[PDB]
């Protein structure tokens, strides 16, 4: 039931992405055989050729997976009737949604390795600079872990991080469903979390202009932001080094 | 009706009472008990339903 | 060949269209009989949507379109199409209509269906319907107060069947929204404790209004208003003699006081001790009556 012509983007691309999603769901349900059968049904895995269409489809699947909570997760549990004001474990639900996002990313990478498509991952065009899509998935996982630790910082130092979250939301002009939250939406599309750092900084000079002598927060705020930023750099570096 | 014996008019007064009659009577009373059970339950349900409906398509409900 | 029943007479204009005529018929042949139904399309769409109620939201556009085309919707719902509306407002209108139809079961079954299978907008829909339910409670109670104040004061002695029908509609609304809230708390696996507390508060409010509507409807139907001692409105039921009874118990109280003196604690009526467990809150409630302030019988119904 193949669809004719590859081209940059059309309904055939959507069909290919749906097939990739079905094979990935099979892999999550622990079926290497059906996933590999679907993979062979679209592209031969005996080819070592660079396939920009294949890499682009894989990258888009990864983008959708990281920006949307996966199927059959506790996020669907309150999406189906539980939310009127929410229950007492919403932060835990968000944390475990991030956990399942990491698990699904791992399952997808393992699926690609099993079906031999991870080896076929060559490149894609981003911002005018060429990136290997294996590296792209690695960065997806790195910034997913960054979102996880970002939720951790959100829990530990709430007022400043939430102020930065809302400021970045304002600068991002992305809508929030009432079932979701501001932090949840920000943590879903992990592609644009960078806004939070300069939002923090702007708030920093805003406060420090006002701060006068005999102030301990005068240094405490800087201590906090220093630790937090160092920690995200730390976790990204260690994930990259470990998973190279 | 206590165990005060009535004046017999036929020998049909002492007629019948066999074990077959007992079995038939017990089966019949079981069956009629079940049927009247269902009928009375439906009657009470219909009574309550009609009482709660009031004037939704009805007239003269006063 | 028959037509449907309306939630409130007279029947709508849909009754006057052939689309409402649902009828089965049989054609004779030289080989047998063939039986068919006519204008069952409306109920076919309705039952298909209900069985898809676990994913009802996505089928609301097409299903609502089919219901509008068949004329199943009330005449007022035909002016708005599912293409120009969204499934959520279509569902809210359908739920409203089910409320005026005195059909709480459809809402309960639909929400139970939504509780299963993945459907992200179900939580939003239930939220919107719950605030809608509470504001509908508020408007219904206000309207009921407006209807009943003229009877409490005494301006209207006999209402019309239309006012009686509106009161019955309000009572049925109270019952249906009770059922809706109680279902909601039944399949509510997760809410804040404050949310549960205030939801129980509002359900208790619904109970108070439901019983109050029942009793006031009973007085209106029996003609016990304005008040039962009003000899002008007593032509079918036992009238009341307030003076005889109140004076008799005043004399009973005085007799009990004179017998008790200072060697007995019994110097108050049994109803007096009864209201005492509830405290003087009832005394303040009834401290607007003649022949004693908060003394049984209180003068105001």
Swiss-Prot record, chain C:
Disulfide bonds, paired cysteine numbers: none
Chain segments annotated as coiled-coil in the UniProt record: none
Subcellular location: Nucleus, Nuclear pore complex; Cytoplasm; Nucleus, Nucleoplasm
Subunit record text: Interacts with the Nup107-160 subcomplex of the NPC.
Domain notes: The N-terminus forms a highly conserved seven-bladed beta propeller decorated with long loops and mediates anchorage to the Nup107-160 subcomplex of the nuclear pore, synergistically with the central alpha domain. The disordered C-terminus is responsible for the interactions with chromatin.
Known function: Required for the assembly of a functional nuclear pore complex (NPC) on the surface of chromosomes as nuclei form at the end of mitosis. May initiate NPC assembly by binding to chromatin and recruiting the Nup107-160 subcomplex, which may in turn recruit membrane vesicles containing pom121 and tmem48/ndc1. Association with chromatin may require the presence of the mcm2-mcm7 complex, suggesting a mechanism for coordination of nuclear assembly and the inactivation of replication licensing.
UniProt record similarity statement: Belongs to the ELYS family.
UniProt name for this protein: Protein ELYS
Source species: Xenopus laevis
Annotated gene: ahctf1
Residues included from the entire protein: 453 to 753 of 2408
